[PDB]
Amino acid sequence: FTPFPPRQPTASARLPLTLMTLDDWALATITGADSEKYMQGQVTADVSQMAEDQHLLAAHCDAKGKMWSNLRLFRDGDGFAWIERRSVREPQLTELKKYAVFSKVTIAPDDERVLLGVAGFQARAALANLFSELPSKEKQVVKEGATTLLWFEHPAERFLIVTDEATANMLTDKLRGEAELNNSQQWLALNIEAGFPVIDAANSGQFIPQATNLQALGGISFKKGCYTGQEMVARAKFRGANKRALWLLAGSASRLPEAGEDLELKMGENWRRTGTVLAAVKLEDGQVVVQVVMNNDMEPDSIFRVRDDANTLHIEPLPYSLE
């Protein structure tokens, strides 16, 4: 079917109708009688209380609570599928499979299905012509034949499509010259804007889930039964235990910081390396936008920069509360 070529991404507010190939994300599945039990023991979400029409962003942690990756989970066949960054799928699956020697599950990558995104102006009306039913806030996953559609509210309405090559080709042919075409960087920009954490390889194993605000995004149950890393995830909820959070910065820079890179914070006439970048994109309207993990008590008027840059970044209020 083939990835779409990149064009410079746009902020959600000004984003035209856009169809994207999500090549930098990747799919995996679990099937078998023990699918729910097995996943319940390895992720932060309560998968026993996930309906067929729901999807959520969970964490898969090691025994110390550090996330191999977050993952967007939904029911698929008699088990689950999930989407995470391609750069971490291989090690994530190795670590997930460590406990499955005798369990009634089969865990595998899925590179047969195609991941697409639809976003921007009138995305819903454009798609309503191409599928009988679309997902919505009231029914967040819809399935039609080979296709699974996931609804997102943030930062503006958009849809993630999990489908076969034939349907991907149909959609592309039907929307060509109406939807702009872009690649993963546009979906990435939207996740940065929404404050939804992205974990690439450099950041695998580095963060407890709450350092990336996952508790505020519905990704952690504190009442479910035991799972790998649970004790440490629970400890991070104590008053004052976790000192990090995920932030949204915007401004200008001469280069994008890489995942795992630090930024610099201004203080007096000095600059101090601070934080860990998760993702960054340069937008059409000129700004660099950056998702970063740093201390949860940064002053709102803090001034940042990409290391040694002539220009600066500032905090854009996160669109959801951490209270």
Decide if 59 contacts 136 (C-beta within 8 A): no
- Residue 294 binds Cl ion, judged by CB under 5 A: no
| Distance from C-alpha of 304 to C-alpha of 311, rounded to nearest angstrom | 9
Query: Shortest approach of Cl ion to residue 22 CB, angstroms?
Result: 27
In whole angstroms, what is the distance from residue 286 CA to residue 13 CA?
Answer: 14
70, 71, 92, 121, 136 from 206: Cα distances, Å: 12, 15, 13, 36, 34
Report if residue 68 touches Cl ion, rule: CB under 5 A. Answer: no
Distances (CA, A) of 116 to 164, 165, 187: 10, 11, 10
Q: Tell me how far apart the 2 most distant CA atoms of the chain are, in Å.
A: 61
Q: Which lies closer to Cl ion via its Cβ, residue 79 or residue 229? A: 229
Site string for Cl ion, 20-39 (x = CB under 5 A): --------------------
User: Among residues 180 and 262, whose Cβ is nearest to Cl ion?
Assistant: 262
Binding of residue 207 to Cl ion (CB under 5 A): yes
Length of the chain: 323
Please tell me whether the peptide bond between 135 and the residue prior to it is cis, using omega within 30 degrees of 0.
Answer: no
Residue nearest to Cl ion (CB): 211
Which of these segments, 35-43, 210-218, 222-230, 301-309, binds Cl ion (CB under 5 A)?
210-218
* Candidate segments 44-52, 56-64, 128-136, 211-219, binder of Cl ion by CB under 5 A: 211-219
Is residue 211 close enough to count as binding Cl ion by CB under 5 A? yes
Shortest reach from residue 209's CB to Cl ion, in Å? 9
Burial status of residue 63 (CB atoms within 10 A of its CB: 0-12, 13-18, 19 or more):
exposed
4 counts as binding Cl ion under rule CB under 5 A: no
199 is an interface residue for Cl ion by CB under 5 A: no
User: With binding defined as CB under 5 A, does residue 208 bind Cl ion?
Assistant: yes
List contacts with Cl ion (CB under 5 A).
207-208, 211
